[PDB]
Amino acid sequence: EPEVLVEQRDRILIITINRPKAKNSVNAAVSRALADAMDRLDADAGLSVGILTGAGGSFCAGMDLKAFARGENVVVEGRGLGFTERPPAKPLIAAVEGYALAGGTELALATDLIVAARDSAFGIPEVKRGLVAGGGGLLRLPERIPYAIAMELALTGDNLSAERAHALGMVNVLAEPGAALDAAIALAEKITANGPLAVAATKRIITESRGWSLDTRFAQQMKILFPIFTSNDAKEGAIAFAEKRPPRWTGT
Amino acid sequence: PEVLVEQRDRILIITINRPKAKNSVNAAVSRALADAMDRLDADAGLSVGILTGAGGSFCAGMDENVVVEGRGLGFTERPPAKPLIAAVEGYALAGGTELALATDLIVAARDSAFGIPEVKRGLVAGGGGLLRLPERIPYAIAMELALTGDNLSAERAHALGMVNVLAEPGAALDAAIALAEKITANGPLAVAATKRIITESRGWSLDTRFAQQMKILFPIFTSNDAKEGAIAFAEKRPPRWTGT
Amino acid sequence: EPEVLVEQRDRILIITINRPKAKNSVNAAVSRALADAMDRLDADAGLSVGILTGAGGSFCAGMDLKAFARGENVVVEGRGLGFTERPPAKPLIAAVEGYALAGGTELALATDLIVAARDSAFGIPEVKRGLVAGGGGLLRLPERIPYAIAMELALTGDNLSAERAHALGMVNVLAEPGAALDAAIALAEKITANGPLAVAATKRIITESRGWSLDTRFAQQMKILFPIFTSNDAKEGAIAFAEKRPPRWTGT
């Protein structure tokens, strides 16, 4: 059985970490296959949105430390844990059941949107074992929830419940336990109904803009806006609306 | 006149005045907005601006040279130096949301709504909504709103810390004036320096931030208002500022 | 009678501003003794976490204006108001009773975590007196709570209650009035149970990462992670977890 399963439903790619006996921990096989799945997602013109999930009712207990200690290529150059260091250009949704701990919280945080079972949990317990979270949890956590609560979780290693992460605005949608994938699919479909060149460019600006100075950010944004103004989709969106009918996207 | 301007002691009230087009921005509006922000920043007897729209709507979005270079849609690309409060009624969608975000403080009717629907129509929000929404509410909720194009209610924007004040429908301007009055009561230079530091510090490195700040602090130490504030407090009486 | 009390309780350094008379405001003696205590915290191998508090029902009323006016060296070069310009490497917790105003709010913000009494208050009223908060409150407050609320508070000068600062995510823990210090100690102890090199690097990464670009952040982080991989504590964490017993940390 593949250590990561990949399935297309319409224009959504569903990516499932499949080591439920190892609590979906990330070895080199998972890390390469996540990497390849994101490549696939970005390259395939028939796809609009990715969804990341774990098999068997749990998202991911983190990095496979045994595999790392033995020497597998778990943290891939320019990619990290699967894609922690190079997320995909297209929208990516985490669908979380059970535990998303350590590297697993890091994978969730590397996505754009999180849908989490009401009974699921996150955390970076690394320090409790004399480790440090190095898959970007320490870079992204303080950017998703209040700085001091991120600090607190990082230094204590305490769990952060899905409901608390939703209250703090880290988790976008709370689902019925067992129903996270379905809710993430519903969310993915809303995004998929939108203009794909506009969606991608919109994600890029949100993401990159934190690195842009006050003085330069409008000009940097404009370089990304520039192909939108003359895109076929931009003209279609206006035509359809004025024709009072649904839009038809081509990604051009 | 497609934009009204009034002075109320140290407050400037700037009213988009085209309710027929749901207060959408044309070149007259845009140029007059920019004109009013410059007026706000020039007069040392003004401390705070308020931006509102006439007749139960704030601004519907973009309506012809509407986007003044170096300034944007009225002021989206160079907001004023001084504090600016949006007073929101009805729909503030698309470019109207961007106008609201370009202000510092948002006072909104409890029945008003925000949103950046641009992607639904194969467009991208270019007036700063994508730059500012993620600064104002949690990053992932901003991402969600941007990619889906869904509305964000005034009550939810208030819960997320983007709307400073919920007001009764029809009363957003009055609440905005009360908020402005709480600010015009404070030292004019110290208020202005306070906004400047908060704004610019976003872009200062940890190793330079205090020295960068000290440059702004410097004339406050010797300002007449600093002495007046000290004199007024011991004397247990209200301060009489001069903006020097 | 000394103006800053410093007490060790096991691995916790407790630092008490001791000028209840002057509402624990910072003159040059308090300022230098705060810096000395932060130096002691970082230098002492038997120390893991600091707690900053104020004697007598109040945290700190801010800079001592009478001291500043008579020309005392209150704002120490390279340190600021005690440590506002140079916080310590080890974790630091503010334990807040009564008022933490003006420079007092800025002291609390220069810590990593805030434990506040349910009836305590924060704020930066400077502008009401024609002054400007120069101890970092204008730098840090918009990093702790929603940006436009930070903006609002700085311009109006309004108090922010402990309950509101907690709802906003600035205060980590609400304590019983009069028992802020004990709740800070319990929080310190959770952090003290964790691996000291790992905790120190964790705080470091969270703090510094705010200034690293997207395309350099993982490499800058790696520089800090590097000695964690081969530290004796990472090994001790594994062995202690293997043997199902408390880890015995060495800081190596």
UniProtKB/TrEMBL annotation, chain B:
Pathway: Steroid metabolism; cholesterol degradation. The keyword Phosphoprotein does not apply. GO terms for biological process: cholesterol metabolic process; fatty acid metabolic process. CDD domains: crotonase-like. The keyword Lipid metabolism applies. Transmembrane segments: none annotated. It catalyses: a 4-saturated-(3S)-3-hydroxyacyl-CoA = a (3E)-enoyl-CoA + H2O; a (3S)-3-hydroxyacyl-CoA = a (2E)-enoyl-CoA + H2O; (22E)-3-oxochola-4,22-dien-24-oyl-CoA + H2O = (22R)-hydroxy-3-oxo-chol-4-ene-24-oyl-CoA. SUPFAM superfamilies: ClpP/crotonase (SSF52096). Could possibly oxidize fatty acids using specific components. Belongs to the enoyl-CoA hydratase/isomerase family. Homotrimer; substrate probably binds in elongated tunnels between the subunits. PANTHER family: ENOYL-COA HYDRATASE, IP11341P-RELATED. This is Enoyl-CoA hydratase EchA19. It comes from Mycobacterium marinum (strain ATCC BAA-535 / M).
